[PDB]
Design a protein around this ligand. Structure first.
Ligand SMILES: [Mg+2]
Ligand SMILES: [Mg+2]
Ligand SMILES: [Mg+2]
Ligand SMILES: [Mg+2]
Ligand code: NA
Ligand code: NA
Lengths: 31, 994, 994
């Protein structure tokens, strides 16, 4: 079975997402 | 139902409305299934993603840091309301970095719990029920049992649900209720009703409680209650934490990690203390409030990033992954802590038949008496072709096929085989193959007769199904098997009494047929049948028979052969008492030898090499066989347990011979004994005992009920996948395929797993040491903070996020099975290992602060250039008769910080490659061996460049993108970590071999 | 050049090298043309298609919506990531939709720009230049002017480039530099050099700045700078946003949309707000947070389509396409706000000559004295044939052609005409027609002499060019025009002083020739020439003359006729002072009457009807003419300004008469006056002013310099296309053809455009109120959402995309020119109108949620069928003792959604057909009247069918293709909108007429 690849994608998106929410969140106080 | 013990057997059959012959009907099945539900416990809720993240944010330090970052932001307004942006954004950064650093943890624990759980998937609980579909027994999932259907249980079975005893098929029934009643001793049962309905469990001696074991016998019964209604199900809604023990590895790891936790904390308070003389400084609003807070944050942050967190979790994660791998290879890990032990295995006692061999029983050879004349003794040897239970083959004499029917000796021979049999053949249609119905020994016998056809009966005009027992049927047509004097180990044989079919008034026409070990059967022979005649058993005749038996049992086929005999004048049908086994040998005397069948079950192909592998691994294998001492030794030679020519007189014992030794000598025997033949069930236990008294870690095979004691006794209990449920529950591991080779694989997995755990540890511990020598080296030498809280916690989120978890996919190390078994005494982290940890750790730390100091002291093509006294960077605003064209505000340049970060991260990816093998060079174990890791290195470097080039990010992160030259410097400063560890590896490899 | 003001006249002529007689050479032309560039400003770039798209992607709402559409999806893969397909594609469709939304937006603003800039194409800036090509003046594009060439400017001209004054032809030169200098008063200019080169514009009194007007005079000069080097050019690189005003109508509309916006906001966050007790539904994964997001998406997805964004832009759309049509009908709209006014036009003051008439001047009739005997007085009346300026026609007496040279009176008559003349004729070869060279009045006179030929000179043997001035030349061969005492309105006449040719010693031979209004000319006569004789002027003679003049001026030809007289004994050549006009009448006395020329300029054919059309529109027409009172009234009667018989004693005033009224009486005179004769320039302003005092919207024609003030005062200033550029810059609209009829057409268009503006509004507002009550009705009756966001925004992209824009092609309404002028006071959206918007609006919404309700409550041939309590669909999974064979998951059926959408869309097409006329029935105004809209209907339905039938689509859109029967239900539910509006229309049309 091995959910191996799902493990690297999820840990690539959790640090992708929280960086996207940094671009976003910084600008909602910039304006 | 309710109080089914109080009711009578019929009152129960009635209540549900079913006969103990029909079983349930597909209707009632679906009805009960809906009225009652599946036979199981309620699949518990569990926990939510939301909840676990919250529970993560319950750390003092986590709270502390986050609270102090709120206060220092709330004091970013009062003294000088200047430009903030980043000073507001910091708190929101931290809590998001932390959030994502906790989410990752859930993924780990989910993954952990998952694999562990997913093992039960490999070994589901079954049951024997009678239903409407077919007439015979149907094996099903226990969860698919409806309270009401008829159940059958036998020796070694686990009770699928609460049953009311219908009919005891054996003469006595015994049950191990230990799991519930507590009582170790097996309790007897009956089929009568128990009076008091207000009675207790121990009193319900007509009931069988789900989760109990059948110690001895066979019984029929009707399901009373299932699910939570069960006497066991009503106790599993009691205790939630039915496991409170720590494997001595986690215990030592929680000890070590706790030692770091303490030191890390001290030199974490130290950082906040060696900065008191800077609480007052202007750059902190000139207040002991903001002063003691800008360093308090640094303190708590370092601590949060450097305290080795879920160190126990590393074992949990590692056991998780090992587990699934072992199961993939047909090694079902019952008990988790066992795996740790599995590595340290030093002895394996395996059974021969079925584990070392296939148990694909077939008769190869057989002889009868040809001609006897004083000293002249000729044998009629035959070979039979085809090793499958299939009645397809031929009987050859001197390499030419013959008609066995044309040999009177063979007619009797085949007669005895068909009538001394309790097993038979069955042609499967779905599979399209013939298969056994009873013991393999007896089934091989059945097949023999079907090939011989001593009566030239038809075969080709018979369906594949009728073929199955054709010639056997015929043989039974002639004689009437009256009764059987079954086998006993005390005499090593068995017999049947038979009367002719076509006989009215016969006083002398009854015959006894004997089958058993050659040894004793031959001794109870005074006549040697010659075709149809009979002569006296001379000494020479007995000699010729024996030598051929010896030949075959010692040959390169190591055959297990049986002697066949008849008694022509059997004692009176009445003089015979069919109770005491002690009188059977007395009836089975005054015999006429007929012939001998030699039969074969070949060793598994793999066994040969698997054994060799254990030799290499320094693991002693001990064979335990039911063959005689002769054949037993032969087999050991044949499979490499013994050399071709080496001496074995003191390395192979029979049960008897063992018992004849005094206790001191028996202990002595086990230190070098490799073969045991014809033993008693008790011997397994004693052998283990002795083995333990030498500090050996033992793996012991078993599959029977009387195996349980020794299995529980052993360090690694190994039950056969096809064995008793009693055996399995008492063992720490189950062989899916019953294969000895599998056990050897399992051990290799133990070693391997132990190594991967070391990989993870080295990487975490070392990276954290560096994480601390960094922030301490800057505080000590008074240097400008090379990394700020947000940067450190980010680096933390990447390191312990991608490469670390990608280490979970490290291939097995090399020397793995060329080492002696590890001692379960040796400590986890050795002194050398700790030196290794410090060296590397300390080096990354110094390499980080030196990366920052490179942009100042030795600043090439960049500002600063303050070769000296970069140390005292506080007396810049005030005491500036030392500044030369240098702005004080440069100590806040986003370049040194970007140096530090851009080196620490790179050095971690390097260190990750160092953690492929525990000792083996990257030239002997190339980096592209773990592609997962290599992919993780890419993603990590993706994130770094992005946090540096996407304009909003580098700003809030206090970072500025670096030039190609400075990147080359990063490499020129990181890459020597590979070389350092490489040196250390070469020292650990060539100077400290083990 | 540089600082040409500091340089002398020659220093400039030199610097470029050109004589102020030669002008520039084709070589020098091409050269400077490349060395300097075309005389104009650098065409601005503006922005790019994509660059503006992004700008639209900046809304609070577009952000918020396009955010919580990805927040929702991230909480979809990572919280409970089940089967998604549509869940991922939704956000990636919202943006795709929004992209195609802006594309329409930008397209419309492009089209709005195009029409606007395309107006300057109609009225190109010209210049008068002297060059090498020809000897006379050359009229060219101002852009084709190279700094260096010689420029001539005159009264009423725009200065084409920055010019250095060479030579002032008139006696003084006045210039209106208001536009740059800010000084309102006209400044005098000179040809001398201004000292300081570092001086200011206001001081450069020898310069003429491009963009300025010649207030009075004529001058010659040389171009210094052009393009961006200009003193105006360097200022046009200053302000880009010069639209710092908005019509009181735009505001009245932005105010209304702002109100709706506010209400659309309230009943939008009330939709989400009232939906809290549904945040925890199982289909929401039971999440306060997931529920908030989902309903929060609906709220904002409303706003984005519900709030009317481009209302202020719709006004502009209209004006754009209105202006364009107007210009196509020869009415160039200088001022954009003006169009809105143009509708409300209540009064038009038009000049007669050239605007009401063709100004195709020609002499029809003429008389001279036949015989006088005391009380007997006979006239010699003649008619001339041919109304063209062509010298081709014949002089009849009593319908019989005669030889005019045979009548002495006529000889002198023609002499006076040829010598009291400053104009002449010219035969054009290209056109092959004769054309005037000077004032029409005078040229018509030249034509008369050419037709008469009082000397029987040759004609036929002369080229078509020599014929032009033949006889005229002859008459000049006889007399020598010494000087002329030019015309002054204070005496209504003019004269020349002539000496004979071959005659030196003739102190008694010189004559004075007078021509002017019969009135005063006749009164300064004491003799009446009879052929070659003279007699005294008696009372009866004067009476015969005057009666004939009256007859002609009042007849069905309304001739404007002049009297021709001579002074036989003129005062001495020296006794006369030629400076003061006051002394001229004194000279022109003691005269001999010769004869009278009666001349015609016919009224334009269309004028007649146009006036009628004005009567119908409730718009009053005021004729201003230079004729005497009598003829003026005559003309008015003749063109229908007055009734054939009606009394007009108080509706016609002369300049004089008006001035003799006191101020209060004057104001009174304007309220009913319709004819003004012989007025001063000032009377235009005063008239306007009084008309303003009655709240009239006045249109005022003008063409001369002294017209500017009144043109600026009037609400609609209308300059003639053939007039001074000063009049044009002062006015709001230019008559390409100078046709009075064109003005009327311009007003009609004004009314029409207001209507189309009404159309657009109704449709937009209404459809939107619908789009809201739809989503509020389903949220208030708690129904299963009739529409989802992706559906809504799709409908929005179509509705405000194809039908809405196609309405811009609506033909003009019907009662358009039969009502009285709209008051600029009455509001845009009236009470009745609002009620009309709500009705249709609130209806389509009801019909959309009903369309879904029908698939449930009244569900025919379809599932649901839940007659009641479809309301509480949330308590279906939980409280299901009410369900009867109904799967709860039906509330997410792809059918009720396909109803709502498939209904809303069809009702919008219907509503668009309601928006063909503001009040007129589809039977009075057939739907096949706007083919473009009809075409938009097809395409809109083409997209709808396709989004239901091409498999990828209906899936992503939560839609299933419906059956022909259910389509009939759609119709049976949409089409009653047609009827509803039709009802309301019939109400306004028959009950609230106006
Ligand atoms: Mg760490
Ligand atoms: Mg066995
Ligand atoms: Mg809309
Ligand atoms: Mg005029
Ligand atoms: Na054990
Ligand atoms: Na005006």
């Amino acid at each position: 079975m091995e959910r191996s690849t799902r493990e690297l994608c999820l840990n690539f998106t959790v640090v992708l997402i929280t960086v996207i929410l940094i671009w976003l969140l910084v600008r909602s106080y910039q304006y | 139902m309710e109080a089914a013990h109080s009711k009578s057997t019929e009152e129960c059959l009635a209540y549900f409305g079913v006969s103990e012959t029909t079983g349930l009907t597909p209707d009632q099945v679906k009805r009960h299934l809906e009225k009652y539900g599946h036979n199981e416990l309620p699949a518990e809720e569990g926990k939510s993603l939301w909840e676990l993240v919250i529970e993560q944010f319950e750390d003092l330090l986590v709270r502390i840091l986050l609270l102090a970052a709120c206060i220092s932001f709330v004091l970013a307004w009062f003294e000088e309301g200047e430009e903030t942006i980043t000073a507001f954004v910091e708190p929101f950064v931290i809590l998001l970095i932390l959030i994502a650093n906790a989410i990752v943890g859930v993924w780990q624990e989910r993954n952990a719990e998952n694999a562990i759980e997913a093992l039960k998937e490999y070994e589901p609980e079954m049951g024997k029920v009678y239903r409407a579909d077919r007439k015979s027994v149907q094996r099903i999932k226990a969860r698919d049992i409806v309270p009401g259907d008829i159940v059958e249980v036998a020796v070694g079975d686990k009770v699928p649900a609460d049953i009311r005893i219908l009919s005891i098929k054996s003469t006595t029934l015994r049950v191990d209720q230990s799991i519930l009643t507590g009582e170790s001793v097996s309790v007897i049962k009956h089929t009568e009703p128990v009076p008091d309905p207000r009675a207790v469990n121990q009193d319900k001696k007509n009931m069988l409680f789900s989760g109990t074991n059948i110690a001895a016998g066979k019984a029929l019964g009707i399901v009373a209650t299932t699910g939570v209604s069960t006497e066991i199900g009503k106790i599993r809604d009691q205790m939630a934490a039915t496991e409170q023990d720590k494997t001595p590895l986690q215990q030592k790891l929680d000890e070590f990690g706790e030692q770091l936790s303490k030191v890390i904390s001290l030199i974490c308070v130290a950082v906040w203390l060696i900065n008191i003389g800077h609480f007052n400084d202007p750059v902190h609003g000139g207040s002991w409030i903001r002063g003691a807070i800008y360093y308090f944050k640094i303190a708590v942050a370092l601590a949060v990033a450097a305290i080795p967190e879920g160190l126990p979790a590393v074992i949990t994660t590692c056991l998780a992954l090992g587990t699934r791998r072992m199961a993939k290879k047909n090694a079902i890990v019952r008990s988790l802590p066992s795996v740790e032990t599995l590595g340290c295995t030093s002895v394996i006692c395996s059974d021969k038949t079925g584990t070392l061999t296939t148990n694909q029983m077939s008769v190869c050879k057989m002889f009868i008496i040809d001609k006897v004349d004083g000293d002249f003794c000729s044998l009629n040897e035959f070979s039979i072709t085809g090793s499958t239970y299939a009645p397809e083959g031929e009987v050859l004499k001197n390499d030419k096929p013959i008609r066995s029917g044309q040999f009177d000796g063979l007619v009797e021979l085949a007669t005895i085989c068909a009538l001394c049999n309790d097993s038979s053949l069955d042609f499967n249609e779905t599979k399209g193959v013939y298969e056994k119905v009873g013991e393999a020994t007896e089934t091989a016998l059945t097949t023999l007769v079907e090939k011989m056809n001593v009566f030239n009966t038809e075969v080709r005009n018979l369906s594949k199904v009728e073929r199955a027992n054709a010639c056997n049927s015929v043989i039974r047509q002639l004689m009437k098997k009256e009764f059987t004097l079954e086998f006993s180990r005390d005499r090593k044989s068995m017999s049947v009494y038979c009367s002719p079919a076509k006989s009215s008034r016969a006083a002398v026409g009854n015959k006894m047929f004997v089958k058993g070990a050659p040894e004793g059967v031959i001794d109870r022979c005074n006549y040697v049948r010659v075709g149809t005649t009979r002569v006296p058993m001379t000494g020479p005749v007995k000699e010729k028979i024996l030598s051929v038996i010896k030949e075959w049992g010692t040959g390169r086929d190591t055959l297990r052969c049986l002697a066949l005999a008849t008694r022509d004048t059997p004692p009176k049908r009445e003089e015979m008492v069919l109770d005491d086994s002690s009188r059977f040998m007395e009836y089975e005397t005054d015999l006429t030898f007929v012939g001998v069948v030699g039969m074969l079950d070949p060793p598994r192909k793999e066994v040969m090499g698997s054994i060799q592998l254990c030799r290499d691994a320094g693991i002693r294998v001990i064979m335990i066989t039911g063959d005689n001492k002769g054949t037993a030794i032969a087999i050991c030679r044949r499979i490499g347990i013994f050399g071709e020519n080496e001496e074995v007189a003191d390395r192979a014992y029979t049960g008897r011979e063992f018992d004849d030794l005094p206790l001191a000598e028996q202990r002595e025997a086990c230190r070098r004994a490799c073969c045991f033949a014809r033993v008693e069930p008790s011997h397994k236990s004693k052998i283990v005992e002795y083995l333990q008294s030498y500090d050996e870690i033992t793996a012991m095979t078993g599959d029977g009920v009387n195996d349980a004691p020794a299995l529980k006794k052993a360090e690694i209990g190994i039950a056969m996948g096809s064995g008793t449920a009693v055996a399995k529950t008492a063992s720490e591991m189950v062989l899916a395929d019953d294969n000895f080779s599998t056990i050897v694989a399992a051990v290799e997995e133990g070693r391997a797993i132990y190594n991967n755990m070391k990989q993870f540890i080295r990487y975490l511990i070392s990276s954290n040491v560096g994480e601390v020598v960094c922030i301490f080296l800057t505080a000590a030498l008074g240097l400008p903070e090379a990394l700020i809280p947000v940067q450190l916690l980010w680096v933390n989120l990447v390191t312990d996020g991608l490469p670390a978890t990608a280490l979970g996919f490290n291939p097995p190390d090399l020397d793995i099975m060329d080492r002696p078994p590890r001692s379960p005494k040796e400590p986890l982290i050795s002194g050398w290992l700790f030196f290794r940890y410090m060296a590397i750790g300390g080096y990354v730390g110094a390499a980080t602060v030196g990366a920052a100091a490179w942009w100042f002291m030795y600043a090439e093509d960049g500002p600063g250039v303050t070769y000296h006294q970069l140390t005292h960077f506080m007396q810049c605003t005030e005491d500036h008769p030392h500044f030369e064209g240098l702005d004080c505000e440069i100590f806040e340049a986003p370049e040194p910080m970007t140096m530090a970060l851009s080196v620490l991260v790179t050095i971690e990816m390097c260190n990750a490659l160092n953690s492929l093998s525990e000792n083996q060079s990257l030239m002997r174990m190339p980096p592209w061996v773990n592609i997962w890791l290599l992919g993780s290195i890419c993603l990590s470097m993706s994130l770094h460049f992005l946090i540096l080039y996407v304009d909003p990010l580098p700003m809030i992160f206090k970072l500025k993108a670096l030039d190609l030259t400075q990147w080359l410097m990063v490499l020129k400063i990181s890459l020597p970590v590979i070389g350092l560890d490489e040196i250390l590896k070469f020292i650990a490899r060539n100077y400290l071999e083990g």
